[PDB]
Amino acid sequence: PPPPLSHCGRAAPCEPLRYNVCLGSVLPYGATSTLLAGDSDSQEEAHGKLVLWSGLRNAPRCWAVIQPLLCAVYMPKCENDRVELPSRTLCQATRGPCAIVERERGWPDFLRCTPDRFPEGCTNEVQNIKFNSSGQCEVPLVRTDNPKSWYEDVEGCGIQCQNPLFTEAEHQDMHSYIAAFGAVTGLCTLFTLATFVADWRNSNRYPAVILFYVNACFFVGSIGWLAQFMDGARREIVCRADGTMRLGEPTSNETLSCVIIFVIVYYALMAGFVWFVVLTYAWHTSFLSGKTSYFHLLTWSLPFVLTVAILAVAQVDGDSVSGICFVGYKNYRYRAGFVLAPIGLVLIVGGYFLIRGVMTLFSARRQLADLEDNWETLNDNLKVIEKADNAAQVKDALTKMRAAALDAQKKDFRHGFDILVGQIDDALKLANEGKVKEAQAAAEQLKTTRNAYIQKYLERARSTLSKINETMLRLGIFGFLAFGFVLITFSCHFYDFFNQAEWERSFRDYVLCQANVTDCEIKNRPSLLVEKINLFAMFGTGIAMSTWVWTKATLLIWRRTWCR
Ligand SMILES: CS(=O)(=O)c1ccc(C(=O)Nc2ccc(Cl)c(-c3ccccn3)c2)c(Cl)c1
Ligand SMILES: *[C@@H]1O[C@H](CO)[C@@H](O)[C@H](O)[C@H]1NC(C)=O
């Protein structure tokens, strides 16, 4: 029994302990003092302050070091009218893990590690006392030892893998939607690819070959989206090794599984849009075999660059609702710059080719509509000269035929119309002179020039309009239909980015309030039905482009291979 040092003590009247327990541990000493605790001026009041301090049970790292400190200040050892001052080593041990205390409320003057009221080289009785109460994390926080997993300053607790803003039943509902849409797309797109490889001889040709790689992109995308449906795959792709949600991937000492599924989904998504722009450019140029090298470069290099960029900045995060890893689930700025930015460009570039595509379709359609209008004006006015008996009537119909000839005129075509124009002038002089018989005979000469040379150009014009009937219009229908779905996808990704500033605030507010309790309400969360609309647009194009081989010719392709 050695006598303790003068500086490690403080002269105080020692009153007996009311409670024989401090924060779930027995006390050996009998007397205490309420002067070390500034706020407390009674033992009952000290226990009333200790029960508020015990609210730090959550966050084990702080709770493990604050328990011997709180008992050394509020319920300390008092013997021979002197209270034991707590050692600075016991005090400094809290400064680090209990950094949350300084931030949330701030350390009081009596609980600050100053050389006075906290001296060095002092042996405490609380140091001998062992506390077994620790390791408590309030859900949605899960107990983890990984420092790169601890949510905010709550050292010891990390954010759980399952999204706390959505229920277990709601997850099941979204996963049922992804399974159904994924399987239908997966089977439809594979069928198209199987039909294309079966007739590869004829199939590897523009513009049909474009749709083959389009489907290939939607097939790979389906594999990545359906990957979560393997036993325990969703809680391997989206969940970290400790059980926390995956963030900032590629991260150190963690399975590549997350960035694998991200690369498969995002790359096949982006390459699908570059192949869409190729399809729209093909519909523009239809009105290309030597450009195959240029097509395959941009469709596989540009998405590669964007994917490598995301992996370099490490912005791959995982959502339990989607069941896949993606760019910018946490930091939406990186999502907009890598999802809305390229999808924004494909609507500008791809759309421009669809606009100039219909522009040329209706321009060439108008050319024959105007030339057939002038053909009838010539035919009807010739019947007027035939019907006419007056020299003024013949003169009137020839002047109408002359204006219609010049209107239809605007080298092989120019030479032919000059003969007709010249013949009208030769006929016009006869009408001016008063001759009706000679002018009517001259009009019949225009019929022979029309019936053998001008007729051939009209026949060639009507034939080109019949060329547009099937494939020329089919590619356009698929191009506009795909554009529609891309416009839906853009709107859904934009809606998310728009409200992600408030959804971050509401997610943070719900997790931090549930961290401590002896009700918490979700302010606002992202709309799942809008996410279902996005998946309807994504998988919708997958099935919509799969209908290219939905022709009568493909039925005979499968019948021929059946015999083989
Ligand atoms: C509240 S938060 O943590 O900011 C958060 C949480 C979840 C999301 C979110 O929308 N997740 C999600 C949930 C479900 C789906 Cl299907 C998707 C999706 C849709 C289309 C393409 C790829 N993934 C995405 C977002 Cl943007 C933000
Ligand atoms: C629990 O943590 C919140 C901050 O997330 C804080 O406002 C609250 O005071 C803490 N509870 C206790 C009892 O200290």
UniProtKB/Swiss-Prot annotation:
| Keyword entries, A-Z | Cell membrane, Cell projection, Developmental protein, Disease variant, Disulfide bond, G-protein coupled receptor, Glycoprotein, Membrane, Phosphoprotein, Receptor, Signal, Transducer, Transmembrane, Transmembrane helix
Disulphide-bonded residues:
8-122, 14-78, 22-71, 62-98, 91-113, 137-157, 161-239, 258-325, 513-520
Bilayer topology annotation: Multi-pass membrane protein
Residue numbers on the Cytoplasmic membrane side = 199-206, 280-293
Alphabetical GO biological process terms: anterior/posterior pattern specification; apoptotic process; astrocyte activation; atrial septum morphogenesis; cell fate specification; cellular response to cholesterol; central nervous system development; central nervous system neuron differentiation
Tell me what happens on changing residue 548 to L.
In basal cell carcinoma and ameloblastoma samples; somatic mutation; constitutive activation of the smoothened signaling pathway
Give residue spans on the Extracellular membrane side: 1-177, 228-258, 315-337, 496-537
A GO cellular-component term linked to this record: intracellular membrane-bounded organelle
Instruction: State which residue ranges cross the membrane.
Output: 178-198, 207-227, 259-279, 294-314, 338-358, 475-495, 538-558
Function noted in UniProt: G protein-coupled receptor which associates with the patched protein (PTCH) to transduce hedgehog protein signaling. Binding of sonic hedgehog (SHH) to its receptor patched prevents inhibition of smoothened (SMO) by patched. When active, SMO binds to and sequesters protein kinase A catalytic subunit PRKACA at the cell membrane, preventing PRKACA-mediated phosphorylation of GLI transcription factors which releases the GLI proteins from PRKACA-mediated inhibition and allows for transcriptional activation of hedgehog pathway target genes.
Q: Which family does it belong to?
A: Belongs to the G-protein coupled receptor Fz/Smo family.
- Which disease is reported for it? Curry-Jones syndrome: A multisystem disorder characterized by patchy skin lesions, polysyndactyly, diverse cerebral malformations, unicoronal craniosynostosis, iris colobomas, microphthalmia, and intestinal malrotation with myofibromas or hamartomas.
**Stated name of the protein:** Protein smoothened
Source species, please?
Homo sapiens (Human)
Q: What is the lineage of its organism?
A: Eukaryota, Metazoa, Chordata, Craniata, Vertebrata
Gene (name only): SMO
Tell me the stretch of the parent sequence this chain holds.
57 to 551 of 787
